[PDB]
Amino acid sequence: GTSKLKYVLQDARFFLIKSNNHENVSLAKAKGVWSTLPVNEKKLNLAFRSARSVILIFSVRESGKFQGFARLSSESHHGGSPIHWVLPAGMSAKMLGGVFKIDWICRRELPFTKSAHLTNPWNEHKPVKIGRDGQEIELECGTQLCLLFPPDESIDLYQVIHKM
Numbered sequence: 001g002t003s004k005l006k007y008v009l010q011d012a013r014f015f016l017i018k019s020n021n022h023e024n025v026s027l028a029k030a031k032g033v034w035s036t037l038p039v040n041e042k043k044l045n046l047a048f049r050s051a052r053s054v055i056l057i058f059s060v061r062e063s064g065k066f067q068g069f070a071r072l073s074s075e076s077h078h079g080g081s082p083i084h085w086v087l088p089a090g091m092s093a094k095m096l097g098g099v100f101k102i103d104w105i106c107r108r109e110l111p112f113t114k115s116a117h118l119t120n121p122w123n124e125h126k127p128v129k130i131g132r133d134g135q136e137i138e139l140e141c142g143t144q145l146c147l148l149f150p151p152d153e154s155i156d157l158y159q160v161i162h163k164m
């Protein structure tokens, strides 16, 4: 069912993560990590101290879908094992901030066609699929969007709850 999920999402904060390629989301799903540019890193560290759960919702551009969502389990840190992100043209790994540890809650995809009824008050009430990398999603919109995903029966939320 969906009860433990609703418990994890209670009073959470939600951020949209836009990636240019599937490889970076695959690395994030395998390694339980994400790294963002410093502008977003500062927002996510502030958010992590501010709320009981901070949720990242991932979408690969041109895919027409979200690829899943995850919960920050740490503030960002530096000096860990290198991660071979696939960067946009002209970019270098040094442009990134630190690395956040994340616990995946759903590794399943959700097509944008299923979230067309959801708009984000923090982005001019544009459909929730629309937003820059790092756009915050308001609480109610973010909760309903997460509840739309197919349940990921491979994940035990008992473990996630046991870090809140």
Ligand SMILES: Cc1[nH]c(=O)nc(-c2ccccc2)c1[N+](=O)[O-]
Residues within 6 Å of the ligand: 020, 024, 035, 036, 037, 040, 085, 086, 087, 088, 091, 092, 093, 095, 096, 133
């Ligand atoms: C994974 C990730 N996350 C992020 O917030 N930003 C980027 C990016 C964008 C331009 C230059 C360097 C990085 C990457 N990336 O590996 O392409």
